[PDB]
Enzyme design. Structure first.
Site, short mmCIF file in Angstrom:
data_model
loop_
_atom_site.label_atom_id
_atom_site.label_comp_id
_atom_site.label_asym_id
_atom_site.label_seq_id
_atom_site.Cartn_x
_atom_site.Cartn_y
_atom_site.Cartn_z
N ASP A 8 0.86 -1.17 0.00
CA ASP A 8 0.00 0.00 0.00
C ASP A 8 0.91 1.24 0.00
O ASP A 8 2.08 1.15 0.37
CB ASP A 8 -0.90 -0.04 1.23
N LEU A 9 0.40 2.39 -0.44
CA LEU A 9 1.18 3.63 -0.47
C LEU A 9 0.92 4.49 0.76
O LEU A 9 1.80 4.63 1.61
CB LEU A 9 0.89 4.41 -1.76
N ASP A 10 -0.29 5.05 0.87
CA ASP A 10 -0.61 5.97 1.95
C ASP A 10 -0.60 5.25 3.30
O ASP A 10 -1.31 4.27 3.50
CB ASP A 10 -1.96 6.66 1.73
N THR A 16 0.00 10.81 2.63
CA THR A 16 -0.62 11.73 1.68
C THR A 16 -1.83 12.42 2.31
O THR A 16 -2.44 13.30 1.70
CB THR A 16 -1.09 10.98 0.40
N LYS A 45 -9.67 7.90 5.06
CA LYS A 45 -8.35 7.28 5.04
C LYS A 45 -8.38 5.93 4.31
O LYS A 45 -9.09 5.01 4.72
CB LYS A 45 -7.84 7.08 6.47
N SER A 114 -1.92 0.31 -4.25
CA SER A 114 -2.52 1.50 -3.67
C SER A 114 -3.82 1.85 -4.37
O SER A 114 -3.96 1.62 -5.56
CB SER A 114 -1.55 2.68 -3.81
N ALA A 115 -4.75 2.44 -3.62
CA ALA A 115 -5.99 2.99 -4.18
C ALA A 115 -5.74 4.29 -4.97
O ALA A 115 -6.61 4.73 -5.72
CB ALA A 115 -7.00 3.24 -3.07
N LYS A 145 -10.87 -1.71 -2.07
CA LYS A 145 -10.67 -2.42 -0.81
C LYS A 145 -11.95 -2.21 0.05
O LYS A 145 -12.49 -1.10 0.06
CB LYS A 145 -9.44 -1.89 -0.07
N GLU A 169 -0.04 -2.93 4.92
CA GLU A 169 -1.22 -2.05 4.96
C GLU A 169 -1.38 -1.34 6.30
O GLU A 169 -0.93 -1.85 7.33
CB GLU A 169 -2.49 -2.85 4.66
N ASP A 170 -2.03 -0.18 6.27
CA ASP A 170 -2.32 0.62 7.47
C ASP A 170 -3.82 0.75 7.76
O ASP A 170 -4.18 1.47 8.69
CB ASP A 170 -1.74 2.03 7.32
O1 LIG Z 1 -7.43 10.59 -5.31
P1 LIG Z 1 -6.29 9.54 -5.40
O2 LIG Z 1 -4.87 10.19 -5.49
O3 LIG Z 1 -6.54 8.53 -6.69
O4 LIG Z 1 -6.19 8.74 -4.03
C1 LIG Z 1 -7.18 7.74 -3.65
C2 LIG Z 1 -6.96 7.43 -2.23
O5 LIG Z 1 -5.61 6.89 -2.01
C3 LIG Z 1 -5.34 6.39 -0.62
O6 LIG Z 1 -5.88 5.21 -0.41
C4 LIG Z 1 -5.64 7.51 0.47
O7 LIG Z 1 -5.49 7.02 1.67
C5 LIG Z 1 -7.03 8.12 0.21
O8 LIG Z 1 -7.25 9.15 1.17
C6 LIG Z 1 -7.21 8.55 -1.19
O9 LIG Z 1 -8.53 9.07 -1.39
F1 BEF Z 2 -2.22 3.89 -0.79
BE1 BEF Z 2 -3.15 3.05 0.03
F2 BEF Z 2 -4.45 2.77 -0.84
F3 BEF Z 2 -3.52 3.73 1.40
MG LIG Z 3 -3.13 3.13 3.25
#
Ligand SMILES: O=P(O)(O)OC[C@H]1O[C@H](O)[C@H](O)[C@@H](O)[C@@H]1O
Ligand code: BEF
Ligand SMILES: [Mg+2]
Ligand code: NA
Length: 221
Positions: A8-10, A16, A45, A114-115, A145, A169-170
């Site tokens: 996962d990224l965030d 972010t 989140k 990541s989403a 997710k 993941e967080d």
């Molecule tokens: O709007 P994006 O850059 O595609 O990010 C989509 C999502 O990414 C992550 O999962 C963050 O935790 C979310 O807060 C964010 O809405």
């Molecule tokens: F970038 Be992950 F979807 F929080």
């Molecule tokens: Mg995350």
């Protein structure tokens, strides 16, 4: 031994959330919606862009056309993208760069799950692009997710089965997505924000190759 790690990224590689918060708040204030505060932002989140906007409109009780909805999401994203231009390698979370180096050195695949549709640019800002064997595309899965789709895609993108992978993941939804893919989750944060029956570390400084290997062996029968 595991063949891949699915990141996962965030909340794992970087944060972010403050950028997203400022952007969503600005959008909410632009359309005259109350309620988008730091408490509410916790609900967003790990949530997709579209699902996040829908939650904000339900502060509410706001109805909009399909095209108005798309325009609002575009507006917020355009603002978000301006703000992340100054993301840098200093924003990489503790331990993560060395973990990536150690995985690469040991020929373990590295994939992003990541989403965020801004994932590739963020990895470039942090000078991490070269470490990633593949990036699963949010726009070609969904099911967001807790659906396992993004983790399955990430694993397959680097030629491995989720069963041969660890997921980091967080979030609750992310942990469940990893489980339902067949990969092994290791969560970062507090257990009440992650889930049960999983290994959990309090912060990313605990994510070492040595620890991942130990956890892997503990979860094999
Ligand atoms: O709007 P994006 O850059 O595609 O990010 C989509 C999502 O990414 C992550 O999962 C963050 O935790 C979310 O807060 C964010 O809405
Ligand atoms: F970038 Be992950 F979807 F929080
Ligand atoms: Mg995350
Ligand atoms: Na900075």
């Amino acid at each position: 031994m595991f063949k891949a790690v699915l990141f996962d990224l965030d909340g794992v590689i970087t944060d972010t959330a403050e950028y997203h918060f400022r952007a969503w708040k600005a959008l909410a204030e632009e359309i005259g919606i109350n309620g988008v505060d730091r408490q509410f932002n916790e609900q967003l989140k790990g949530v997709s862009r579209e699902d996040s906007l829908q939650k904000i409109l339900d502060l509410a009780d706001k109805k909009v056309s399909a095209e108005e909805f798309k325009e609002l999401a575009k507006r917020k994203n355009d603002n978000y993208v301006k703000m992340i231009q100054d993301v840098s390698p200093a924003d990489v979370y503790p331990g993560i760069l060395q973990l990536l180096k150690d995985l690469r050195s040991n020929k373990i695949k590295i994939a992003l799950a990541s989403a965020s549709k801004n994932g590739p640019f963020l990895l470039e800002r942090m000078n991490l692009t070269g470490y990633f064997d593949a990036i699963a595309d949010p726009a070609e899965v969904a099911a967001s997710k807790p659906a396992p789709d993004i983790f399955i895609a990430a694993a397959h993108a680097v030629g491995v089965a989720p069963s041969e992978s660890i997921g980091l993941e967080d979030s609750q939804a992310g942990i469940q997505a990893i489980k339902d893919s067949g990969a092994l989750p290791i969560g970062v944060g507090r257990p009440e924000d992650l889930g049960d029956d999983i290994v959990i570390v309090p912060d990313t400084s605990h994510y070492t190759l040595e620890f991942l290997k130990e956890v892997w062996l503990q979860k094999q029968k």
